[PDB]
Amino acid sequence: KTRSSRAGLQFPVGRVHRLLRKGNYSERVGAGAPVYLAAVLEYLTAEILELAGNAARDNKKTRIIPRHLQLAIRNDEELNKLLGRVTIAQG
Template identity: 75%
Template sequence: MDGGGAKAGLQFPVSRIGRYLKKGRYAQRVGTGAPVYLAAVLEYLAAEVLELAGNAARDNKKNRIIPRHVLLAIRNDEELGKLLAGVTIAHGGVLPNIHSVLLPKKAAERAEKAASATKSPKKAAAAKSPKK
């Protein structure tokens, strides 16, 4: 199996992946296209994670991607989050999340909502305009 990565335009090592597939005894025989396809899939996933992690680093005004950025990228993406749901990333931390019940309630906002919650728009307009 020659390194088919150059022909396929891949960066990931096709011959090494082919060697791992054979050595791992996943099947008695491994086709020539299998390592190329697997290398392409792995390269795509790596590029996707790196792009999202780079965006997370830029959002935090950093030039270097750290494990925290990788975690934020994975957990904030629906599909990657589902794929890597059971994965723990070392030094990644946790997603910032405060349950809405625990957030402080503002008394002014509640008073405004109660005043504006009248039965019909005509009554709300009449309540705002002063009567003569």
């Protein structure tokens, strides 16, 4: 089983681990680091995407668009703080 599939996660744990190993974050990297991290990513991702699909409904759409993510983050007091100074690019 892939490490991700061991964890049942969609997120590529090897990628997260590989990013850290080659990414100069440390001299060595223990499995618990990318494992925890990959899970956290899906969690926040779902946390946002959950709001995004809701926003899509709240936008009459089955198709999510950037416009929907803006409503999610500003209406969510946490994303509002986590993404407080972040910039979203779109023509």
